[PDB]
Amino acid sequence: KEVIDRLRYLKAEIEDLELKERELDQQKLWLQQSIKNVMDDSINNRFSYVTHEDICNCFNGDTLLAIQAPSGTQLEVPIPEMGQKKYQINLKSHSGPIHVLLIN
Template identity: 45%
Template sequence: MVSQNIRRLYEEEAFDKGSFENFCYVTHDDMRRQESFADQSVMAIKAPPGTTLEVPDPDEGMPSGKRRFQVFLKSTDGPVDVYLVRRMADENESENIEDSAKAGTDLAALESPTPPLDQTDPDFCFNLDDNEGISDFFADIS
């Protein structure tokens, strides 16, 4: 019911874009709908300010034709949470979920909702222009 109301807000012609200015976060569904992320592994990282992220060259020190992908995160100011953003494109996956529900598995216990990030940090809002989206933070490497 709530998701239908939100959808109606987006579909209304009289939608006031300024009414959503305070929402400086991206939902799981927002990430899954991004075409630029299709067929890619996407990680969402929740970390305190000052966290360092290092991604070494995947070819360095590896035999020809082999790659090793690594991500190093370091924070001295608190915990770092990393989430894998999955696309539910495979119909078999949705069938498995339905089968689990029929078998009596409580799916709510398996997936706990994550509240939006704290908006008190001045770096939280990405200062996007009206014509920009979260995918603009990721370069297209061709």
């Protein structure tokens, strides 16, 4: 039949697809690890910043608000319902205080 070895063929390809994902899942998990090791060198953390000019060059006009918080800080944005509509940002930081810079 045309279908029963449309099966055997498809069921022969997904394992190559399966192992490819296993590989891609291992590559991603210790690429992430290698990214974590770089951004916590104490020398690298010393120069992990951006200036006003950089922000201004990538954001034409308007009011810009820069919010800085420690890692793992959660940001929650609810739906623009009406109560006037509500546009808000709920910030939760457990590891420290947050720093807010007003860009001009």
